[PDB]
Design an enzyme around this catalytic site. Structure first.
Site, PDB file in Angstrom:
ATOM      1  N   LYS A 104      14.407   8.898   3.954  1.00 32.88           N
ATOM      2  CA  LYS A 104      13.121   8.793   3.282  1.00 32.88           C
ATOM      3  C   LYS A 104      13.355   8.523   1.805  1.00 32.88           C
ATOM      4  O   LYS A 104      14.363   8.947   1.235  1.00 32.88           O
ATOM      5  CB  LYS A 104      12.279  10.060   3.461  1.00 32.88           C
ATOM      6  CG  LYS A 104      10.782   9.826   3.373  1.00 32.88           C
ATOM      7  CD  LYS A 104      10.232   9.290   4.681  1.00 32.88           C
ATOM      8  CE  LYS A 104       8.831   8.740   4.502  1.00 32.88           C
ATOM      9  NZ  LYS A 104       8.175   8.470   5.808  1.00 32.88           N
ATOM     10  N   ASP A 144       5.577   2.746   3.329  1.00 37.08           N
ATOM     11  CA  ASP A 144       4.949   4.037   3.580  1.00 37.08           C
ATOM     12  C   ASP A 144       3.712   4.168   2.698  1.00 37.08           C
ATOM     13  O   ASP A 144       3.165   3.156   2.249  1.00 37.08           O
ATOM     14  CB  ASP A 144       5.933   5.183   3.338  1.00 37.08           C
ATOM     15  CG  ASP A 144       5.529   6.456   4.058  1.00 37.08           C
ATOM     16  OD1 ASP A 144       5.746   6.537   5.285  1.00 37.08           O
ATOM     17  OD2 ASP A 144       4.971   7.364   3.413  1.00 37.08           O
ATOM     18  N   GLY A 220      -8.603   4.507   8.892  1.00 36.05           N
ATOM     19  CA  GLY A 220      -7.733   3.653   8.108  1.00 36.05           C
ATOM     20  C   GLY A 220      -7.146   2.545   8.954  1.00 36.05           C
ATOM     21  O   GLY A 220      -7.797   2.059   9.882  1.00 36.05           O
ATOM     22  N   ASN A 221      -5.920   2.125   8.643  1.00 31.15           N
ATOM     23  CA  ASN A 221      -5.243   1.144   9.484  1.00 31.15           C
ATOM     24  C   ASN A 221      -4.977   1.709  10.872  1.00 31.15           C
ATOM     25  O   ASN A 221      -5.355   1.109  11.889  1.00 31.15           O
ATOM     26  CB  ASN A 221      -3.938   0.706   8.816  1.00 31.15           C
ATOM     27  CG  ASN A 221      -3.309  -0.499   9.488  1.00 31.15           C
ATOM     28  OD1 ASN A 221      -3.614  -1.640   9.151  1.00 31.15           O
ATOM     29  ND2 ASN A 221      -2.416  -0.247  10.439  1.00 31.15           N
TER      30      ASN A 221
HETATM   31  N1  LIG Z   1      -0.098   7.521   7.508  1.00 32.66           N
HETATM   32  C1  LIG Z   1      -0.637   7.597   8.861  1.00 32.66           C
HETATM   33  C2  LIG Z   1       0.399   8.193   9.817  1.00 32.66           C
HETATM   34  C3  LIG Z   1       1.838   8.026   9.356  1.00 32.66           C
HETATM   35  C4  LIG Z   1       2.345   6.609   9.534  1.00 32.66           C
HETATM   36  O1  LIG Z   1       1.525   5.670   9.474  1.00 32.66           O
HETATM   37  O2  LIG Z   1       3.566   6.434   9.735  1.00 32.66           O
HETATM   38  C5  LIG Z   1      -1.920   8.420   8.900  1.00 32.66           C
HETATM   39  O3  LIG Z   1      -1.931   9.516   8.342  1.00 32.66           O
HETATM   40  O4  LIG Z   1      -2.896   7.956   9.488  1.00 32.66           O
END
Ligand SMILES: N[C@@H](CCC(=O)O)C(=O)O
Ligand SMILES: NC(=O)c1ccc[n+]([C@@H]2O[C@H](COP(=O)([O-])OP(=O)(O)OC[C@H]3O[C@@H](n4cnc5c(N)ncnc54)[C@H](OP(=O)(O)O)[C@@H]3O)[C@@H](O)[C@H]2O)c1
Length: 418
Positions: A104, A144, A220-221
């Site tokens: 990380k 990230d 979100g995505n």
């Molecule tokens: N960041 C994403 C999950 C972690 C990832 O996408 O690797 C979320 O909290 O929806």
């Protein structure tokens, strides 16, 4: 009081290890990251001044292969968080059977107040600082929180400039744009893996998802793509979606495309036409068959654990369920997909991209989808078989599988003699 992330990760690891036969020396080795690198990241500001930022690069373990992990650009980023996320990435890549370790990165910076030029300078300076500990076969970063493929392209370009093109500089980093060593299916990787896990869980529970209802928390995505892929591939009815501002309820079903367009046009999903307006605190308790938290962590706690009515809880986000909530949900007979198993599709597609870059040969969308399907189905079925054999929790079974693989790799290398 402060609940340090690394302490919580170590506590989780101890809980997991108590459920299996592992030597004390191997557990002590696993409790500590094998290499931590903290560097200064100096960049030139647009006004001409020079600002110095703090960058991190933690490689928890590389027994199974080169370490893998993302880079986070967050103003509240600390070393503890990077260490905990590298520790979790170790088990994430171990459970889905990748030849990877845990890693990380992170820079303490507010990217919202940085210009494009300054962002490029930050990426290039971070690469110049951490070049000595990264490589195609040593450490592969990834996108990230607050990081996109554009930063990946800048970072890969800087690494290629430093390396003088002596090898596969494309494979040093993943998530890059399709024009430069990119991979097809990267954008929808996490949601595709979550959908595969949900389908396998439904197969295990003997319930068909065609015509069923799914509620997604967080739009979100990951949440949007999860809802869309569920509706198309699984034939399920997207009954409720939400974001930070609020949530939407519609028994007849929601069109993810329409909801995304509304959110893009108004900044939030609140007050969608012809739909009931709710919040997360009642969304999590709606009568559904699949609930997919894809938002901020720790949304299911003992307060609301007893009120969950979903037959399947797919933890798309990173740790949205507390251990007390885990016990309560297991007592109710609800099949939970562990957080670092459900969203393992993103790292799997990242591994596929790395393989394509290393080999110099690139695959198609169908090949990537089929390979991801095979990997996720195999990992989920292994975890469920352990969960059925050891009569433990699903998260506990996933931990057992991942830690057992890492421990076997360590024993094979001769790092631990017991
Ligand atoms: N960041 C994403 C999950 C972690 C990832 O996408 O690797 C979320 O909290 O929806
Ligand atoms: C790259 C990271 O992946 P990603 O695409 O998932 O990141 P992301 O785009 O930031 O996803 C965050 C999503 O969860 C929502 N959210 C933020 N706080 C929430 C809360 N307390 N409760 C419920 N939903 C919340 C966000 O809504 P908003 O867009 O309204 O912040 C957004 O929909």
């Amino acid at each position: 009081v402060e609940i340090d992330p690394f302490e919580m990760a170590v506590k989780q690891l101890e809980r997991a290890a108590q459920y299996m036969d592992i030597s004390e020396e191997a557990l002590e080795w696993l409790k500590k990251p094998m290499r931590i690198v903290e560097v200064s990241v100096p960049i030139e500001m647009d006004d001409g001044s020079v600002k110095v930022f703090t960058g991190f690069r933690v490689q928890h373990n590389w027994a199974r292969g080169p370490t893998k992990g993302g880079i986070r650009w967050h103003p509240a980023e600390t070393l503890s968080t990077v260490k905990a996320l590298a520790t979790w990435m170790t088990w994430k890549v171990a459970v889905v059977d990748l030849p990877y370790g845990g890693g990380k990165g992170g820079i303490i910076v507010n990217p919202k107040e940085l210009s494009e030029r300054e962002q490029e300078r930050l990426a290039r300076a971070y690469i110049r600082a951490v070049y000595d500990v990264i490589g195609p076969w040593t450490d592969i970063p990834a996108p990230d929180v607050y990081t996109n493929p554009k930063i990946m392209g800048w970072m890969m370009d800087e690494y290629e400039t430093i390396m003088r093109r002596k090898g596969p500089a494309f494979g040093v980093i993943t998530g890059k744009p399709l024009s430069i060593g990119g991979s097809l299916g990267r954008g929808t990787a996490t949601a595709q893996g979550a959908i595969f896990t949900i389908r396998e869980a439904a197969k295990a529970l003997g319930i068909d998802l065609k015509g069923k209802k799914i509620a997604v928390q967080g739009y979100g995505n990951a949440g949007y793509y999860t809802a869309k892929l569920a509706k198309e591939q699984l034939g399920m009815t997207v009954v409720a979606v939400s974001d930070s501002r609020g949530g939407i309820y519609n028994p007849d079903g929601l069109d993810p495309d329409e909801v995304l367009k509304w959110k893009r046009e108004h900044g939030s999903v609140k007050d969608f036409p012809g739909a009931t307006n709710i919040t997360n605190e009642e969304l999590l308790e709606l009568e559904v068959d699949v609930l997919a938290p894809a938002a901020i962590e720790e949304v299911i706690t003992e307060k609301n654990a007893d009120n969950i009515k979903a037959k399947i809880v797919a933890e798309v986000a990173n740790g949205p369920v507390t251990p007390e909530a885990d016990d309560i949900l297991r007592e109710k007979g609800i099949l939970q997909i562990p957080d670092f198993l459900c969203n393992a599709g993103g790292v799997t597609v990242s591994y596929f991209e790395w393989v394509q870059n290393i080999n110099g040969y690139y695959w198609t969308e169908e090949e990537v989808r089929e390979k991801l399907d095979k990997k996720m189905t195999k990992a989920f079925w292994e975890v469920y078989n352990t969960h059925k054999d050891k009569n433990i929790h699903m998260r506990d079974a996933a931990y057992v599988v991942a830690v057992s693989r890492v421990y076997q790799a360590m024993k094979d290398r001769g790092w631990v003699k017991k």
